[PDB]
Design a protein around this nucleic acid. Structure first.
Ligand SMILES: [Zn+2]
Lengths: 92, 143
DNA sequence: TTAGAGAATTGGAGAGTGTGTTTTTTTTTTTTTTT
DNA sequence: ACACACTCTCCAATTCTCTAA
């Protein structure tokens, strides 16, 4: 056989390398200021997510990363279990 | 090995032949006619007059590249008079991420060595009657 | 309204095939024989 | 025989459709 293809998958997201890093650091990473423009602060939010997206899965363009994440986010039940777990933690 | 050991050798090395007064063929000078095909590979001594000298230019020994997408560097060693540069990042980590990145050459981390070429020719008073003088090509590297 | 089982369309991996390559002045400086 | 240009082929990745809970 030819070599099988490599893909983004929910296992990567649920790994310690994956989504928990964002929730462990996002409160410290991003910082808005009224003292800078709407364009300035809007440009600031996407830095951390772009670098994180590259570190997670360097395959594809950034838009493709988001639009790929949409499918597995809607479909996979284990990922949805993790997400309801997050919002239950806030309900706690 | 991570990189070829030639990339970090900061020195040159040469042999000096035996003193004839202690003496072996390397101590006994040969004219340019006496250098037969038997001597290929050996260390010898030659006596004659130099005819022309070239000016110095660099020659590559180890070439360095950079991969754009995965941010990784690879090396290539050159021995022959010509070579083909690399054009694909065959690194295993880069491959397993399916990251078909592009390689670019860099001078700032390559290794060069000085080169010069000359030619030597037999003394006119040793030429046998009716013949035309012969000559040899000399290469010089390093200090 | 979600999701999972089955069918159809497309991409490009990669394997294969054929190919090409070595190789009469005119102007100007200098030595030589000829009138 | 050694880099190239071009052709051919198969296989699996993807989206679309139908069914039932
Ligand atoms: Zn690479």
């Amino acid at each position: 056989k030819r070599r099988p293809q490599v893909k983004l998958t929910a296992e990567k997201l649920l790994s310690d390398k994956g989504l928990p890093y964002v929730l462990k650091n996002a409160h410290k990473r991003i910082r808005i200021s009224s003292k800078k423009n709407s364009y300035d602060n809007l440009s600031n939010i996407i830095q951390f997510y772009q670098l994180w997206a590259h570190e997670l899965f360097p395959k594809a363009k950034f838009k493709d990363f988001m639009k790929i994440c949409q499918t597995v986010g809607k479909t996979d039940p284990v990922l949805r279990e993790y997400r309801v777990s997050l919002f239950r933690d806030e309900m706690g | 090995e991570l990189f070829p050991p030639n990339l970090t050798r900061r020195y040159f090395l040469y042999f000096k032949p035996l003193s004839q007064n202690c003496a072996a063929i390397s101590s006994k000078p040969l004219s340019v006619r006496q250098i037969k095909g038997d001597f290929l590979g050996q260390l010898i001594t030659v006596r004659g007059i130099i005819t022309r000298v070239s000016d110095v230019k660099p020659a590559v020994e180890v070439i360095a590249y950079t991969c754009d997408q995965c941010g990784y560097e690879v090396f290539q060693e050159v021995n022959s008079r010509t070579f083909t540069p690399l054009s694909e990042c065959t690194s295993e980590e880069c491959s397993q991420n399916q990251t078909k990145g592009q390689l670019f050459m860099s001078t700032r981390a390559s290794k060069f060595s000085a080169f010069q070429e000359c030619k030597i020719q037999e003394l006119s008073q040793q030429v046998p009657v009716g013949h035309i003088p012969r000559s040899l090509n000399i290469h010089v590297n390093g200090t």
